[PDB]
Amino acid sequence: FVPFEGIKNDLKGRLMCYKQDWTGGFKAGFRILAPTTYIFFASAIPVISFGEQLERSTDGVLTAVQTLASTAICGMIHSIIGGQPLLILGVAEPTVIMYTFMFNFAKARPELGRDLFLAWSGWVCVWTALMLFVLAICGACSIINRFTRVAGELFGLLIAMLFMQQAIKGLVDEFRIPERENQKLKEFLPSWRFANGMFALVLSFGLLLTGLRSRKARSWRYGTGWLRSLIADYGVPLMVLVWTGVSYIPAGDVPKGIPRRLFSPNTVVKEMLDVPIVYIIGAFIPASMIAVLYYFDHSVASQLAQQKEFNLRKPSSYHYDLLLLGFLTLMCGLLGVPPSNGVIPQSPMHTKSLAVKEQRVSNLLQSTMVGGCVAAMPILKMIPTSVLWGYFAFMAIESLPGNQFWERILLLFTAPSRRFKVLEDYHATFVETVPFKTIAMFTLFQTTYLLICFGLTWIPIAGVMFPLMIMFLIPVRQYLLPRFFKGAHLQDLDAAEYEEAP
Template sequence: MYTYLYNFAKGKQALGQHLFLAWAGWVCTWTALLLFLLAIFNACVVINRFTRIAGETFGMLIAVLFIQEAVKGLVSEFKVPKNDDPNKAKYQFQWLYANGLLAIAFSFGLLYTALKSRKARSWWFGTARFRNFVADYGVPLMVVMWTALSFSVPSKVPSDVPRRLFSPLLWESESAYHWTVIKDMGKVSPTYIFAAFIPALMIAGLYFFDHSVASQLAQQKEFNLKNPSAYHYDILLLGFMTLLCGLLGLPPSNGVLPQSPMHTKSLAVLKKQFIRKKLVASAKESIKQKASNSEIYNKMQTVFIEIDSSPITTAVVKELKDLQDAVMKVEEDTKLGKFDPEEHIDAHLPVRVNEQRVSNLLQSLLLAASITAMPLIKLIPTSLLWGYFAYMAIDSLPGNQFWERILLLFVPSGRRYKVLEKVHASFVESVPFRSIAIFTIFQIMYFLVCYGVTWIPIAGILFPVPFFLLISIRQHILPKLFQLHHLRELDAAEYEEIAGSPSRAPSLNLREMDSGYGGSNEGEVTMCDAEILDELTTSRGELKVRNLSFREDRRTQQIYHGDYIQPE
């Protein structure tokens, strides 16, 4: 967005380079005002109208733009930067060529090692603690490693080969003009002050979409959070941050990182592990005393109520009833044998989030502390930035159902059964391949429209508009093209991922009719329950409790489609 603003300003004599930050300050002022109005009038409730197709298309656009910037950055390593003296020694042909080759080596090296480090938990070597550390922090470690490697270049090479990041601080001489932004804002003509409202509208729309969707997913009601959601409060604070950054001549800051659903889920896992540990210890103690299953449950219930500080609501009562059923069912079912707390209670533990503000506060403090690390950050080669852009784009693709459906289109019909043998989304089995293909092709075409808008020189600033149009398209057009139960599967949030079984052989042929499944006999399917926290969500991205196994759910779907056959 700031690139569009700069390209617009530099071509205007009334703005130019000197008044660009002042004009951007007016853009941020208008943006802050719009964010204030969104918060005051509770406009954030509209975010519930956005479905998966909007979020995934937006995510794909960001990934493609990151790849695009990475390619442009690599190409620029072979060129003389703008507004620099081409007669300098470091810009001689041989040194430009050497800088470009080093950039390719460093960027692809960072990309490869960063992607490998993310899979460290599946390595065969190293302790579990070491593998977890590499998987969590391997990417910044790879940046440090490749930065250190960049200093192994022979001393005969010019000091600026490879090129390194340039980022002056506010109090340095190169940034002196930042402190004159407020004064220069008065020099901007009224025409351009009011014209700044148009890009401000787009930035406010981006923030509304990006920040609210992330906040919504991080504060789902099925997480059973004790503290209420604060979407409007967040937007209000974001308005103040945008105004402050604009007056300082900085690009506005967006606080979506603390709102990450991954952050909430990690806290939920911690709380669930804590509850599990206490319940298992209680059950084992009761088993040692040769207590009956009902006595085991009574003890576990007491421990559960002591640990869980949530009020006794209908949901809590249901959770306790599910836990009781899990304990008592073992006693009734001789096939399950003796009750084992390590094995039989996992699927019935409640979702609880260890609510705290420490990690959010630390994230903000570390971001502020990074200012003091600027002398170290300036040592990083620019080529690592391009590799990191490519890494973020590629790393965002797994889990994006849009991307997975695109890959499915290129799987030959005779090989589609391989998809079912691996972990896969349930829509693969519950939606005919013809519907999957048509929906994916429509989404690809719409994505190309969104991407094409970004290439329009000045009007490219309007690229958020197509995403808001998706609200009407999803509500009024798509339901006429697809069956509603298929649309709910394809345009919902993440559905359960299921460990496939090689014994299944349903058809995924394009000619498949709307039966929804290639096999009709339930006995052909060997499934396991997939009641995992990160894998159960509703059409709005909310977690849901699912007591049926997928086998039972498949029978329900077959009845729904009218093709259920009683198993032998």
């Protein structure tokens, strides 16, 4: 834990390949575009969905333009001066949740209001950058090995639940009058509101079901190899386009705003000095919580992108990456946009697509395209919001497959006389090596923790504390769990490597 040691080590490790990285990227030629476009489509649509969530949750202060710009800037900078180019940057759901909490707090206070929300957010980002610098300097990244599977899987399921809740909220709001739209428009008549809601249900469920079916095209039997690969890779953007075109079918027989489409339109230092000093101090709380969230997620995403099975020939840069994230957080705060952090499963998808051809080019190009999406905002404003709610549900459902916590929940909800069906197919090792009752106790404890965190998320002010509960899982797993469980049981239940059996 010698100060600055990790940063110097990572800088020296990565400084012997910079030219090699760029040249290898250039040598890839035009064949490097397919992974680039694949990751670009994997990253842009979720970012637009988060932007729409912010727009509906920030009264239009933050929209898809801000999230797109933040993603582009942070990604390109991480490409140029980052330590782990394979890591994908963007605006993630936890950041959106923290910003929603911050806005809900700021609005209720006449001192700050909606006009000083961005200034307060920038102060929060300054504090977060300070804490990230402190963490990177004090060598806290040396203990990333303690982020055991339990915490990662619980956080994944929590994010999936948040996505599902957001999709349901969007579908429910599709039946109502938007808060900041004229109420005398013909499209907001009760008949047209009901029609718009029903059309939104149709479009969202069509998108969701077709995407889920298309995810598994390479296991189909019809069509050419290149077509099957194309479907399995781009079923998401293809379905988004198809259901947009479908949404345009009755356009001639219905009012202009049927179905509803993206509401997003086509420096804040001066206001920073106007924030009362007391709130500049009070920005410490959300700043600390955001620092915790980032310290978790960036490290976990880098780890996932740097799995040993990839046989990567270049070292890791956890400390330098955290320092660069602190700087990026500061700059995003100054520019009045939400900060970005490493994202999942975008980084592992980028790594698998590059399978390895490590370079700083693919990420740079994909971030440049995500930024250029801003210049095409008139094109993006053709997408209905029901498609975005369907996409939220799609992400929620797709977070589950590789999660052992979800599998153990399913085992819990399986009838006793039916575990042979579970054994018949692929499964984990703890099913055979561990007694069922211990698995049940573990799953009950994990589920209780997850529901406690989800319920805390609903608290208006104190609900900004869920990163603390997530972080508490490290000391709990370290000390309390061994008391109530026995060695190999915990080791197999909380293995760092995904084990499967035939």
